[PDB]
Short mmCIF file of C-alpha atoms and ligand atoms in Angstrom, two decimals:
data_model
loop_
_atom_site.label_atom_id
_atom_site.label_comp_id
_atom_site.label_asym_id
_atom_site.label_seq_id
_atom_site.Cartn_x
_atom_site.Cartn_y
_atom_site.Cartn_z
CA UNK A 7 20.46 -22.45 1.35
CA UNK A 8 17.78 -19.70 3.22
CA UNK A 9 19.55 -18.36 6.47
CA UNK A 10 15.81 -18.26 8.18
CA UNK A 11 13.68 -21.36 6.67
CA UNK A 12 10.03 -20.55 6.78
CA UNK A 13 10.35 -17.27 8.32
CA UNK A 14 10.26 -13.82 6.78
CA UNK A 15 9.56 -11.63 9.37
CA UNK A 16 12.65 -10.82 12.28
CA UNK A 17 12.73 -9.11 15.55
CA UNK A 18 15.56 -6.25 16.09
CA UNK A 19 16.25 -9.44 19.21
CA UNK A 20 17.02 -11.74 16.69
CA UNK A 21 19.50 -9.68 14.51
CA UNK A 22 20.89 -7.00 17.05
CA UNK A 23 24.45 -8.31 17.69
CA UNK A 24 24.27 -10.17 14.04
CA UNK A 25 23.87 -7.31 11.57
CA UNK A 26 27.03 -7.45 10.09
CA UNK A 27 25.44 -10.83 8.43
CA UNK A 28 22.48 -8.82 6.09
CA UNK A 29 22.83 -6.39 3.32
CA UNK A 30 20.22 -3.78 4.92
CA UNK A 31 18.18 -1.98 3.01
CA UNK A 32 15.83 0.98 4.31
CA UNK A 33 12.71 1.35 2.23
CA UNK A 34 11.02 3.92 4.06
CA UNK A 35 8.39 5.66 1.99
CA UNK A 36 5.34 8.28 2.81
CA UNK A 37 1.99 8.24 0.64
CA UNK A 38 1.52 11.97 1.48
CA UNK A 39 5.32 13.04 2.50
CA UNK A 40 7.21 15.07 -0.50
CA UNK A 41 10.80 13.15 -0.31
CA UNK A 42 10.28 11.59 2.85
CA UNK A 43 12.39 8.48 3.41
CA UNK A 44 15.18 10.55 1.93
CA UNK A 45 14.42 13.14 3.89
CA UNK A 46 14.85 10.54 6.61
CA UNK A 47 17.22 8.37 5.79
CA UNK A 48 20.24 11.07 5.97
CA UNK A 49 18.71 12.62 9.77
CA UNK A 50 18.79 8.68 11.19
CA UNK A 51 19.56 5.37 9.68
CA UNK A 52 20.41 1.88 11.09
CA UNK A 53 24.48 2.05 10.46
CA UNK A 54 25.46 -0.56 7.08
CA UNK A 55 22.14 0.16 5.60
CA UNK A 56 21.21 1.16 1.87
CA UNK A 57 18.37 2.61 0.74
CA UNK A 58 15.12 1.89 -1.48
CA UNK A 59 13.15 3.94 -3.30
CA UNK A 60 9.22 3.62 -3.25
CA UNK A 61 8.51 5.04 -6.02
CA UNK A 62 11.69 5.06 -7.95
CA UNK A 63 13.36 1.72 -6.91
CA UNK A 64 10.48 -0.72 -6.67
CA UNK A 65 7.81 0.31 -9.22
CA UNK A 66 8.48 2.18 -12.52
CA UNK A 67 5.26 4.44 -13.34
CA UNK A 68 3.90 4.22 -16.69
CA UNK A 69 1.59 6.36 -18.84
CA UNK A 70 -0.18 4.11 -20.19
CA UNK A 71 -1.79 2.67 -16.62
CA UNK A 72 -3.12 4.03 -13.18
CA UNK A 73 -1.58 1.56 -11.55
CA UNK A 74 0.02 4.14 -9.02
CA UNK A 75 3.09 1.14 -7.87
CA UNK A 76 3.53 -1.42 -10.73
CA UNK A 77 6.30 -3.20 -11.06
CA UNK A 78 9.53 -2.43 -12.58
CA UNK A 79 11.19 -3.62 -15.68
CA UNK A 80 13.00 -6.87 -14.08
CA UNK A 81 15.94 -5.64 -15.76
CA UNK A 82 15.82 -3.04 -14.40
CA UNK A 83 15.49 -3.81 -10.27
CA UNK A 84 18.09 -6.23 -10.85
CA UNK A 85 20.58 -4.16 -12.20
CA UNK A 86 19.76 -1.80 -9.60
CA UNK A 87 20.49 -4.60 -7.20
CA UNK A 88 23.57 -5.70 -8.33
CA UNK A 89 24.72 -2.23 -8.23
CA UNK A 90 23.73 -2.39 -3.91
CA UNK A 91 25.24 -5.84 -3.68
CA UNK A 92 22.05 -7.37 -3.43
CA UNK A 93 22.61 -10.01 -5.17
CA UNK A 94 23.30 -13.23 -2.50
CA UNK A 95 26.51 -12.69 -0.68
CA UNK A 96 24.52 -12.03 1.88
CA UNK A 97 20.43 -12.01 2.45
CA UNK A 98 18.51 -8.65 2.43
CA UNK A 99 16.77 -6.95 5.33
CA UNK A 100 15.02 -5.07 4.98
CA UNK A 101 12.71 -2.53 6.82
CA UNK A 102 10.43 0.62 6.80
CA UNK A 103 8.64 2.81 9.22
CA UNK A 104 4.96 1.21 8.95
CA UNK A 105 6.38 -2.83 10.18
CA UNK A 106 6.74 -3.40 6.78
CA UNK A 107 3.89 -2.09 5.13
CA UNK A 108 4.78 0.54 3.54
CA UNK A 109 7.84 -0.32 1.19
CA UNK A 110 9.97 -3.34 3.29
CA UNK A 111 7.36 -6.42 2.61
CA UNK A 112 7.48 -4.58 -0.69
CA UNK A 113 11.08 -5.26 -1.31
CA UNK A 114 11.09 -8.74 0.41
CA UNK A 115 8.24 -9.45 -2.13
CA UNK A 116 10.22 -8.84 -5.14
CA UNK A 117 13.70 -10.45 -3.78
CA UNK A 118 11.88 -13.13 -2.92
CA UNK A 119 9.95 -13.45 -6.22
CA UNK A 120 13.01 -13.86 -8.08
CA UNK A 121 14.70 -16.79 -5.29
CA UNK A 122 16.51 -14.55 -3.31
CA UNK A 123 16.71 -14.53 0.85
CA UNK A 124 15.20 -11.50 2.22
CA UNK A 125 13.69 -11.11 5.54
CA UNK A 126 11.32 -7.85 7.06
CA UNK A 127 12.49 -5.98 10.30
CA UNK A 128 9.43 -6.74 12.84
CA UNK A 129 8.35 -3.12 14.05
CA UNK A 130 10.61 -1.24 11.70
CA UNK A 131 12.92 1.71 11.63
CA UNK A 132 10.98 3.02 14.90
CA UNK A 133 11.73 -0.62 16.50
CA UNK A 134 15.05 -0.22 15.63
CA UNK A 135 15.71 3.27 17.13
CA UNK A 136 13.85 1.94 20.55
CA UNK A 137 16.76 -1.02 20.46
CA UNK A 138 19.93 1.11 20.56
CA UNK A 139 21.25 -0.62 17.27
CA UNK A 140 24.16 1.46 15.58
CA UNK A 141 23.24 4.48 13.59
CA UNK A 142 24.58 6.62 10.76
CA UNK A 143 23.71 9.73 9.14
CA UNK A 144 23.58 11.78 6.58
CA UNK A 145 25.03 10.44 2.71
CA UNK A 146 27.74 7.18 3.67
CA UNK A 147 30.84 7.60 1.24
CA UNK A 148 32.16 4.17 1.81
CA UNK A 149 31.11 1.34 1.07
CA UNK A 150 28.22 -0.18 -1.72
CA UNK A 151 30.06 -2.72 -3.27
CA UNK A 152 28.92 -3.72 -6.74
CA UNK A 153 27.90 -7.43 -8.16
CA UNK A 154 29.09 -8.55 -11.45
CA UNK A 155 26.89 -12.16 -11.03
CA UNK A 156 23.79 -12.70 -10.98
CA UNK A 157 22.16 -16.30 -9.64
CA UNK A 158 18.92 -15.62 -9.02
CA UNK A 159 15.46 -15.72 -11.48
CA UNK A 160 15.94 -13.23 -14.05
CA UNK A 161 11.76 -13.07 -14.46
CA UNK A 162 9.31 -12.06 -10.98
CA UNK A 163 7.11 -15.35 -10.31
CA UNK A 164 3.96 -15.72 -8.75
CA UNK A 165 2.11 -12.76 -10.00
CA UNK A 166 -0.84 -11.97 -12.41
CA UNK A 167 -1.32 -8.95 -14.22
CA UNK A 168 -4.84 -8.07 -14.52
CA UNK A 169 -5.75 -10.02 -17.65
CA UNK A 170 -4.06 -13.28 -16.05
CA UNK A 171 -6.32 -13.08 -12.94
CA UNK A 172 -8.77 -16.27 -13.54
CA UNK A 173 -12.18 -15.03 -13.29
CA UNK A 174 -12.89 -16.62 -10.19
CA UNK A 175 -9.94 -16.21 -7.93
CA UNK A 176 -10.55 -15.62 -4.35
CA UNK A 177 -8.97 -11.87 -4.57
CA UNK A 178 -8.43 -10.51 -0.97
CA UNK A 179 -8.16 -6.49 -0.42
CA UNK A 180 -5.60 -4.73 2.24
CA UNK A 181 -6.75 -1.62 2.03
CA UNK A 182 -8.29 -0.27 5.28
CA UNK A 183 -12.05 -0.80 5.90
CA UNK A 184 -13.34 2.56 5.01
CA UNK A 185 -11.66 2.82 1.67
CA UNK A 186 -13.09 -0.83 0.70
CA UNK A 187 -16.78 -0.45 2.29
CA UNK A 188 -16.69 2.77 0.19
CA UNK A 189 -19.91 3.54 -1.51
CA UNK A 190 -20.41 6.99 -3.74
CA UNK A 191 -17.07 8.47 -3.10
CA UNK A 192 -14.00 7.43 -2.39
CA UNK A 193 -10.94 7.70 0.65
CA UNK A 194 -7.27 8.15 1.22
CA UNK A 195 -5.59 7.65 -2.65
CA UNK A 196 -8.59 5.82 -4.43
CA UNK A 197 -10.02 7.43 -7.31
CA UNK A 198 -12.90 4.98 -7.46
CA UNK A 199 -15.58 3.92 -4.87
CA UNK A 200 -15.31 0.02 -4.02
CA UNK A 201 -13.29 -2.92 -4.55
CA UNK A 202 -12.99 -5.44 -6.35
CA UNK A 203 -16.48 -7.59 -6.49
CA UNK A 204 -15.85 -10.13 -4.12
CA UNK A 205 -12.77 -9.32 -2.82
CA UNK A 206 -12.74 -10.28 0.83
CA UNK A 207 -11.12 -7.35 3.11
CA UNK A 208 -7.88 -8.52 5.35
CA UNK A 209 -7.25 -4.21 6.73
CA UNK A 210 -3.10 -4.89 6.94
CA UNK A 211 -3.27 -2.47 9.73
CA UNK A 212 -5.05 -5.45 12.03
CA UNK A 213 -1.94 -7.03 12.04
CA UNK A 214 -0.38 -3.69 13.71
CA UNK A 215 -0.31 -2.82 17.81
CA UNK A 216 1.53 0.81 18.29
CA UNK A 217 4.50 -0.11 20.59
CA UNK A 218 6.10 2.88 21.37
CA UNK A 219 5.79 5.53 18.53
CA UNK A 220 5.32 2.97 15.83
CA UNK A 221 3.74 -0.29 14.95
CA UNK A 222 5.10 -3.62 15.71
CA UNK A 223 3.13 -6.50 14.63
CA UNK A 224 0.02 -8.12 17.10
CA UNK A 225 0.99 -12.20 18.06
CA UNK A 226 1.66 -14.86 16.10
CA UNK A 227 -1.85 -15.88 17.45
CA UNK A 228 -3.33 -12.65 16.72
CA UNK A 229 -2.13 -12.65 12.71
CA UNK A 230 -3.50 -15.75 11.98
CA UNK A 231 -6.88 -15.56 14.18
CA UNK A 232 -6.71 -11.86 11.42
CA UNK A 233 -6.11 -14.19 8.20
CA UNK A 234 -9.27 -16.87 9.07
CA UNK A 235 -11.88 -13.51 8.91
CA UNK A 236 -11.02 -13.77 4.91
CA UNK A 237 -10.42 -18.50 4.96
CA UNK A 238 -14.19 -20.14 3.77
CA UNK A 244 -4.93 -23.70 5.17
CA UNK A 245 -3.20 -23.14 1.78
CA UNK A 246 -4.03 -19.33 0.48
CA UNK A 247 -1.35 -19.83 -1.94
CA UNK A 248 -3.67 -19.73 -5.00
CA UNK A 249 -5.72 -17.08 -3.77
CA UNK A 250 -4.77 -13.39 -5.12
CA UNK A 251 -3.45 -10.81 -2.71
CA UNK A 252 -3.94 -7.01 -3.47
CA UNK A 253 -4.62 -3.71 -1.85
CA UNK A 254 -4.54 -0.18 -3.87
CA UNK A 255 -0.75 0.29 -5.49
CA UNK A 256 0.52 -3.57 -4.50
CA UNK A 257 3.00 -2.67 -1.47
CA UNK A 258 0.82 -3.03 1.59
CA UNK A 259 -0.62 -6.05 -0.29
CA UNK A 260 2.89 -7.52 0.69
CA UNK A 261 2.85 -7.63 4.58
CA UNK A 262 -0.63 -9.57 4.36
CA UNK A 263 1.36 -12.18 1.70
CA UNK A 264 4.54 -11.70 3.88
CA UNK A 265 2.34 -13.02 7.20
CA UNK A 266 0.44 -15.66 5.42
CA UNK A 267 4.38 -16.98 4.67
CA UNK A 268 6.22 -16.33 7.59
CA UNK A 269 2.86 -17.79 9.51
CA UNK A 270 3.58 -21.47 6.82
CA UNK A 271 0.01 -20.66 5.73
CA UNK A 272 1.45 -20.37 2.16
CA UNK A 273 1.80 -18.04 -0.49
CA UNK A 274 -0.64 -15.81 -2.67
CA UNK A 275 -0.48 -14.89 -5.73
CA UNK A 276 0.44 -11.00 -5.62
CA UNK A 277 -2.23 -8.63 -7.84
CA UNK A 278 0.54 -5.61 -8.07
CA UNK A 279 -1.28 -3.08 -10.11
CA UNK A 280 -4.53 -3.29 -7.80
CA UNK A 281 -7.37 -1.45 -7.21
CA UNK A 282 -5.47 2.28 -8.82
CA UNK A 283 -4.56 -0.54 -12.19
CA UNK A 284 -8.09 -2.08 -12.16
CA UNK A 285 -10.31 0.77 -11.45
CA UNK A 286 -8.81 3.13 -13.97
CA UNK A 287 -8.70 0.32 -16.35
CA UNK A 288 -12.35 -0.60 -15.88
CA UNK A 289 -13.68 2.90 -14.84
CA UNK A 290 -16.98 2.99 -17.44
CA UNK A 291 -19.03 -0.81 -15.84
CA UNK A 292 -17.31 0.38 -12.10
CA UNK A 293 -19.27 3.76 -12.09
CA UNK A 294 -22.49 2.51 -14.20
CA UNK A 295 -22.86 -0.03 -11.14
CA UNK A 296 -22.04 2.57 -8.46
CA UNK A 297 -24.63 4.59 -10.38
CA UNK A 298 -26.76 1.74 -9.89
CA UNK A 299 -26.38 0.59 -6.46
CA UNK A 300 -26.11 4.12 -4.95
CA UNK A 301 -27.97 6.46 -7.00
CA UNK A 302 -24.79 8.28 -8.11
CA UNK A 303 -20.97 8.44 -8.09
CA UNK A 304 -18.34 11.26 -7.58
CA UNK A 305 -14.98 11.90 -8.87
CA UNK A 306 -13.00 13.97 -6.79
CA UNK A 307 -11.71 17.21 -8.15
CA UNK A 308 -9.32 17.50 -4.83
CA UNK A 309 -7.56 15.69 -2.36
CA UNK A 310 -10.04 12.96 0.21
CA UNK A 311 -10.21 15.34 2.89
CA UNK A 312 -12.14 12.02 5.00
CA UNK A 313 -10.72 12.87 8.61
CA UNK A 314 -12.23 17.25 8.18
CA UNK A 315 -15.66 18.11 8.78
CA UNK A 316 -18.72 17.21 7.61
CA UNK A 317 -20.35 19.09 4.93
CA UNK A 318 -22.92 20.88 7.08
CA UNK A 319 -25.21 22.83 5.13
CA UNK A 320 -26.61 24.98 8.38
CA UNK A 321 -23.29 26.98 8.68
CA UNK A 322 -21.86 26.39 4.90
CA UNK A 323 -22.89 27.48 2.07
CA UNK A 324 -21.67 24.78 -0.44
CA UNK A 325 -20.55 26.32 -4.57
CA UNK A 326 -22.58 24.00 -6.83
CA UNK A 327 -21.04 24.65 -10.85
CA UNK A 328 -18.92 26.75 -9.23
CA UNK A 329 -21.07 30.18 -7.43
CA UNK A 330 -22.13 29.69 -3.59
CA UNK A 331 -25.29 28.68 -3.84
CA UNK A 332 -27.71 28.98 -1.15
CA UNK A 333 -30.51 27.05 -2.86
CA UNK A 334 -29.45 23.59 -3.20
CA UNK A 335 -31.99 21.57 -3.93
CA UNK A 336 -32.43 17.66 -2.72
CA UNK A 337 -29.67 16.30 -5.03
CA UNK A 338 -27.29 18.13 -4.04
CA UNK A 339 -27.92 18.42 -0.32
CA UNK A 340 -28.46 14.43 -0.65
CA UNK A 341 -24.22 14.53 -2.35
CA UNK A 342 -23.24 16.96 0.58
CA UNK A 343 -23.70 14.55 3.06
CA UNK A 344 -20.93 12.37 1.59
CA UNK A 345 -18.80 15.18 1.59
CA UNK A 346 -16.41 16.57 3.77
CA UNK A 347 -15.00 20.62 4.55
CA UNK A 348 -12.75 21.64 1.88
CA UNK A 349 -13.67 18.94 -0.72
CA UNK A 350 -14.62 18.91 -4.19
CA UNK A 351 -16.36 16.40 -6.22
CA UNK A 352 -17.84 15.78 -9.58
CA UNK A 353 -21.32 14.52 -8.83
CA UNK A 354 -22.57 11.86 -11.80
CA UNK A 355 -27.00 10.97 -10.52
CA UNK A 356 -28.63 8.40 -11.69
CA UNK A 357 -30.81 10.75 -13.95
CA UNK A 358 -28.07 11.86 -16.49
CA UNK A 359 -27.43 14.98 -13.68
CA UNK A 360 -24.28 16.30 -13.60
CA UNK A 361 -22.88 18.67 -10.96
CA UNK A 362 -19.54 20.33 -8.92
CA UNK A 363 -20.30 20.38 -5.57
CA UNK A 364 -17.71 22.12 -3.07
CA UNK A 365 -17.66 22.28 0.80
CA UNK A 366 -15.90 25.33 2.37
CA UNK A 367 -12.58 24.90 4.65
CA UNK A 368 -14.55 25.93 7.12
CA UNK A 369 -17.90 27.08 8.21
CA UNK A 370 -18.72 30.49 6.05
CA UNK A 371 -22.70 30.69 6.76
CA UNK A 372 -23.36 34.27 8.27
CA UNK A 373 -25.94 33.58 10.08
O1 SO3 B 1 -0.42 2.25 -0.43
S1 SO3 B 1 -2.21 2.44 -1.17
O2 SO3 B 1 -2.34 3.22 -2.64
O3 SO3 B 1 -2.82 1.64 -1.41
CA1 CA B 2 -26.48 -3.39 -3.10
#
């Protein structure tokens, strides 16, 4: 059945003169840039490629869930697949602009869980431009081609919803080490510091090297060495997760590709988990570290750290030249421009805001 048995990744070199043989899907997405990928798939895209929207096609936000990219209802996703000719006449070839980690492997995961044939391009769109692949622009007004029969499974396979995760399942976490190892305050998109207890961190960036102006995969032995840091040969029963179930898909993909098995996905991931179990999570943080923070702004980990020699903080909404020792302690964890509500083990609650730039007279 499958075009490339055992594979999920493919270099441009393996596909460049065999393009027509795939249904190509542009899964470009950015966590921060508004309408990215729809803006970028217009400027330029691989010829004959249609586009998948991480937010609206590959997931469906629910009001009753903090999950950031939960699986969409399967019937809705399959409907969308058929409408776009992704129903098994050709194998799907997915790409994004972070080597599969940021949209591509997610689509791959979904198609594969249904029993369909799909692959991801090593190196993404950048390694498509930089390999001389045929390009097109704007909205193509030619050939989608709807399918009317569905030969594949009807429900996504080999994934656990939160309550289905066995109590002592081995869980990995694809998020950056900074996020994983966060104590009293979160970074990037996370609302809660920490991770699922017992989880093993396998930062997905570890498998990637920035050849050109985009990441490509590190070598196979390098990726195998990466994967081995969370083992201790068949990881099919591990539960792979991240912040919202997107980056975890490359960890599952690389494991699959290298022949090491096919781990469960926990799609809801930390965004879901930390929302559902917010109370006990906050109590352990307060217990372990003396305080827990809830951000009132986006996190600004790349901004300058708060420095009380050059800055006066706004505490509970007023400039505060006399910050007591607790506030001063909390502020060592904050950055220029951030605001956070801090819950101290004492029962004390304070809001602290750091000025965007040094603001002390002297
Ligand atoms: O994609 S982030 O939310 O893990
Ligand atoms: Ca501890």
